[PDB]
């Protein structure tokens, strides 16, 4: 599914991402925009052989098993295809774990390069939350 901006904001809000680890909702919406263009099905291969899955582009090197990422971990203990569902619960729950691990949202390259230090509240503007 390709979410609408305020549609994703609302769904991320109900799953408890708004100020989760101090990251306002706009950070999560901004990161999803630039990671996946709000598309739950987005998949992108990394140069290292891993693949990024879903609306928050969670990586197979560390977080999920896709069956083809040799020498890697599955710390969310999920097949990566679970990250492509139109229900974003699995992506969210895995991301809480990622963002909690000491590197915060800097684990998301699109966030660090396109969201961090920006006026991210603009991503939730006009949304009913
Ligand atoms: Au949801
Ligand atoms: Au949830
Ligand atoms: Au994020």
mmCIF file of C-alpha atoms and ligand atoms in Angstrom:
data_model
loop_
_atom_site.group_PDB
_atom_site.id
_atom_site.type_symbol
_atom_site.label_atom_id
_atom_site.label_comp_id
_atom_site.label_asym_id
_atom_site.label_seq_id
_atom_site.Cartn_x
_atom_site.Cartn_y
_atom_site.Cartn_z
ATOM 1 C CA UNK A 1 0.000 0.000 0.000
ATOM 2 C CA UNK A 2 1.096 3.594 -0.749
ATOM 3 C CA UNK A 3 -0.027 5.596 2.323
ATOM 4 C CA UNK A 4 -1.115 9.200 2.310
ATOM 5 C CA UNK A 5 1.081 11.439 4.446
ATOM 6 C CA UNK A 6 -1.522 12.168 7.139
ATOM 7 C CA UNK A 7 -2.785 8.629 6.809
ATOM 8 C CA UNK A 8 0.649 7.303 7.758
ATOM 9 C CA UNK A 9 1.069 9.931 10.514
ATOM 10 C CA UNK A 10 -2.184 8.730 12.077
ATOM 11 C CA UNK A 11 -1.187 5.072 11.873
ATOM 12 C CA UNK A 12 2.292 5.714 13.259
ATOM 13 C CA UNK A 13 0.668 7.730 16.013
ATOM 14 C CA UNK A 14 -1.636 4.922 17.112
ATOM 15 C CA UNK A 15 1.349 2.504 17.232
ATOM 16 C CA UNK A 16 3.115 4.810 19.667
ATOM 17 C CA UNK A 17 5.898 6.335 17.548
ATOM 18 C CA UNK A 18 5.130 10.010 18.414
ATOM 19 C CA UNK A 19 8.062 10.948 20.706
ATOM 20 C CA UNK A 20 9.118 7.357 20.990
ATOM 21 C CA UNK A 21 12.712 7.735 22.231
ATOM 22 C CA UNK A 22 12.268 11.485 21.860
ATOM 23 C CA UNK A 23 11.595 11.339 18.125
ATOM 24 C CA UNK A 24 8.465 13.433 17.282
ATOM 25 C CA UNK A 25 6.041 11.938 14.800
ATOM 26 C CA UNK A 26 7.297 14.205 12.043
ATOM 27 C CA UNK A 27 10.672 12.473 12.190
ATOM 28 C CA UNK A 28 9.083 9.118 11.465
ATOM 29 C CA UNK A 29 6.912 10.459 8.713
ATOM 30 C CA UNK A 30 9.844 12.283 7.090
ATOM 31 C CA UNK A 31 12.001 9.141 7.317
ATOM 32 C CA UNK A 32 9.231 6.999 5.669
ATOM 33 C CA UNK A 33 8.785 9.536 2.895
ATOM 34 C CA UNK A 34 12.467 9.459 1.930
ATOM 35 C CA UNK A 35 13.097 5.767 2.686
ATOM 36 C CA UNK A 36 10.085 4.332 0.827
ATOM 37 C CA UNK A 37 7.902 7.148 -0.562
ATOM 38 C CA UNK A 38 5.296 5.796 1.906
ATOM 39 C CA UNK A 39 5.133 2.432 -0.009
ATOM 40 C CA UNK A 40 4.878 -0.694 2.192
ATOM 41 C CA UNK A 41 6.190 -2.837 -0.708
ATOM 42 C CA UNK A 42 9.415 -0.962 -1.434
ATOM 43 C CA UNK A 43 12.516 -3.146 -1.504
ATOM 44 C CA UNK A 44 16.023 -2.000 -2.294
ATOM 45 C CA UNK A 45 19.228 -3.994 -2.475
ATOM 46 C CA UNK A 46 22.285 -2.714 -0.628
ATOM 47 C CA UNK A 47 25.834 -2.830 -2.019
ATOM 48 C CA UNK A 48 26.748 -5.317 0.747
ATOM 49 C CA UNK A 49 24.158 -7.837 -0.471
ATOM 50 C CA UNK A 50 21.527 -7.144 2.125
ATOM 51 C CA UNK A 51 18.156 -5.712 1.210
ATOM 52 C CA UNK A 52 16.031 -2.952 2.752
ATOM 53 C CA UNK A 53 12.295 -3.835 3.223
ATOM 54 C CA UNK A 54 9.094 -1.882 3.622
ATOM 55 C CA UNK A 55 7.941 1.551 4.560
ATOM 56 C CA UNK A 56 10.941 2.147 6.870
ATOM 57 C CA UNK A 57 13.438 0.179 4.791
ATOM 58 C CA UNK A 58 14.538 -2.233 7.506
ATOM 59 C CA UNK A 59 17.757 -4.012 6.525
ATOM 60 C CA UNK A 60 18.330 -7.783 6.293
ATOM 61 C CA UNK A 61 21.951 -7.456 7.509
ATOM 62 C CA UNK A 62 20.696 -7.057 11.119
ATOM 63 C CA UNK A 63 16.956 -7.120 11.551
ATOM 64 C CA UNK A 64 14.965 -9.666 9.455
ATOM 65 C CA UNK A 65 15.647 -12.869 7.491
ATOM 66 C CA UNK A 66 15.123 -12.794 3.708
ATOM 67 C CA UNK A 67 16.834 -16.104 2.996
ATOM 68 C CA UNK A 68 19.660 -14.574 0.981
ATOM 69 C CA UNK A 69 21.710 -12.374 3.273
ATOM 70 C CA UNK A 70 24.647 -14.557 4.285
ATOM 71 C CA UNK A 71 26.246 -13.876 7.664
ATOM 72 C CA UNK A 72 23.548 -11.663 9.036
ATOM 73 C CA UNK A 73 21.230 -11.385 12.001
ATOM 74 C CA UNK A 74 17.462 -11.457 12.473
ATOM 75 C CA UNK A 75 17.101 -9.343 15.595
ATOM 76 C CA UNK A 76 13.451 -8.545 15.007
ATOM 77 C CA UNK A 77 12.940 -12.264 14.428
ATOM 78 C CA UNK A 78 10.708 -11.927 11.447
ATOM 79 C CA UNK A 79 10.919 -12.796 7.789
ATOM 80 C CA UNK A 80 11.578 -9.610 5.863
ATOM 81 C CA UNK A 81 8.385 -10.122 3.823
ATOM 82 C CA UNK A 82 6.416 -9.309 6.979
ATOM 83 C CA UNK A 83 7.795 -5.832 6.590
ATOM 84 C CA UNK A 84 5.937 -5.451 3.241
ATOM 85 C CA UNK A 85 2.395 -5.903 4.523
ATOM 86 C CA UNK A 86 -0.163 -3.127 4.167
ATOM 87 C CA UNK A 87 -0.365 -3.403 8.009
ATOM 88 C CA UNK A 88 2.627 -1.514 9.360
ATOM 89 C CA UNK A 89 2.631 -3.141 12.788
ATOM 90 C CA UNK A 90 5.705 -5.325 12.124
ATOM 91 C CA UNK A 91 7.740 -2.464 10.649
ATOM 92 C CA UNK A 92 6.866 -0.275 13.642
ATOM 93 C CA UNK A 93 7.634 -2.858 16.269
ATOM 94 C CA UNK A 94 10.950 -3.727 14.660
ATOM 95 C CA UNK A 95 11.818 0.019 14.333
ATOM 96 C CA UNK A 96 11.218 0.621 18.020
ATOM 97 C CA UNK A 97 13.863 -1.959 18.595
ATOM 98 C CA UNK A 98 16.230 -0.405 16.042
ATOM 99 C CA UNK A 99 15.836 3.164 17.342
ATOM 100 C CA UNK A 100 16.288 1.903 20.903
ATOM 101 C CA UNK A 101 19.716 0.331 20.225
ATOM 102 C CA UNK A 102 21.970 3.279 20.956
ATOM 103 C CA UNK A 103 22.227 4.858 17.508
ATOM 104 C CA UNK A 104 18.762 6.363 17.572
ATOM 105 C CA UNK A 105 17.287 7.307 14.186
ATOM 106 C CA UNK A 106 20.795 7.699 12.670
ATOM 107 C CA UNK A 107 20.440 4.026 11.662
ATOM 108 C CA UNK A 108 18.178 5.347 8.839
ATOM 109 C CA UNK A 109 20.415 6.956 6.233
ATOM 110 C CA UNK A 110 17.496 8.912 4.649
ATOM 111 C CA UNK A 111 16.596 10.326 8.077
ATOM 112 C CA UNK A 112 20.074 11.453 8.954
ATOM 113 C CA UNK A 113 20.602 13.082 5.517
ATOM 114 C CA UNK A 114 17.140 14.494 4.753
ATOM 115 C CA UNK A 115 15.263 14.865 8.113
ATOM 116 C CA UNK A 116 17.669 15.408 10.965
ATOM 117 C CA UNK A 117 18.004 19.109 11.809
ATOM 118 C CA UNK A 118 15.060 20.061 9.609
ATOM 119 C CA UNK A 119 11.612 21.348 10.529
ATOM 120 C CA UNK A 120 10.098 17.891 10.609
ATOM 121 C CA UNK A 121 6.781 19.016 12.166
ATOM 122 C CA UNK A 122 5.882 20.145 8.676
ATOM 123 C CA UNK A 123 5.422 16.468 7.795
ATOM 124 C CA UNK A 124 2.364 16.324 10.155
ATOM 125 C CA UNK A 125 0.914 19.680 9.203
ATOM 126 C CA UNK A 126 -2.793 19.685 8.660
ATOM 127 C CA UNK A 127 -3.145 16.072 9.851
ATOM 128 C CA UNK A 128 -5.894 14.941 12.231
ATOM 129 C CA UNK A 129 -4.100 13.063 14.967
HETATM 130 AU AU1 LIG B 1 -1.346 0.328 12.094
HETATM 131 AU AU1 LIG B 2 1.612 -1.227 17.167
HETATM 132 AU AU1 LIG B 3 13.024 6.120 11.518
#
